[PDB]
Amino acid sequence: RATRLKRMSEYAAKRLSSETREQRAIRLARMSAYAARRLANETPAQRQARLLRMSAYAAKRQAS
């Protein structure tokens, strides 16, 4: 696992550092579309858990 995960991270990082502007823009656009649909399709339970995590993070940022 560690040997696989380390090598996976190396491959990913290597791809990322060599991305063209266009490749990065595409990847980010796809991620923002993915997040937006996840947000659109959230259940009431998922929404509540998310808002609680976000308030926890905000409080944490506030304290440091």
Partner DNA sequence: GAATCTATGTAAATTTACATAGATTC
Residues that bind DNA (CB under 7 A): 5, 8-9, 11-12, 15-16, 28-32, 34-36, 38-39, 47, 50-51, 53-55, 57-58, 61
Minimal distance, residue 55 CB to DNA, in Å: 6
Structure tokens at 12: 């990913």
Nearer to DNA among residue 36 and residue 45 (C-beta) = 36
Cβ-proximal residues to 19 (8 Å cutoff; 6+ apart), any chain? 27
Minimal distance, residue 18 CB to DNA, in Å: 11
CB 42 within 8 A of CB 50: yes
Nearer to DNA among residue 9 and residue 21 (C-beta) = 9
Answer positive or negative: Cα dihedral of 28, 30, 33, 39: negative
